[PDB]
Amino acid sequence: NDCIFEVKHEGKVTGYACLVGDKVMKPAHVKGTIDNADLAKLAFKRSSKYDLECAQIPVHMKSDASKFTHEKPEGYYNWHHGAVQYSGGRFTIPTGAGKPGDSGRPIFDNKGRVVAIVLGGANEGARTALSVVTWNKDIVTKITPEGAEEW
């Protein structure tokens, strides 16, 4: 934990950029400059398909990036605003747990490794379906439940 950085704006934080493996994850819909000076200077390749902005970590100096994994067994995970529960192909939370302005928050498994980065959520009544950027064995994927709004 504590490896993430808030992407700062003029007067408030609009999202969170996470360090995973050797890439500086950052959602693309959120805009800002990133707090840390060096990270702001990297070339961020974008993709509207996956709503992501990533760049090679200066791994010569950043040797603290979070571990990652590709398997997502159904169970319970945590995202620093509570505990996210897995079911089928959705992530659900208590309705008030999620809030705008905290998009890009990494979510971990029980062993302290990230599995997905939240982009937004759809309030389903009691639960909130999370739109996340995860990855399978090979390549990233964007699970977007119906009616999910950006954060």
Binding site: K49, I139, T141, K142
Partner: protein, 48 residues
């Protein structure tokens, strides 16, 4: 003159084959680029 003069398309030499060769080569490279782009769109349309 004891003949007539009309538009270009029917007056070009039989050695207009240069035009056909250049146009066909450009059309081939354009078609290959379009096919590659179509294939890339197809997998990108199935990976999401």
């Amino acid at each position: 003159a004891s003949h007539t003069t009309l538009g270009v398309q029917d007056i070009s030499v039989t050695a207009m084959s240069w035009v056909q060769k250049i146009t066909g080569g450009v059309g081939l490279v354009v078609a290959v680029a379009a096919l590659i782009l179509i294939v890339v769109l197809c997998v990108s349309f199935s990976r999401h």
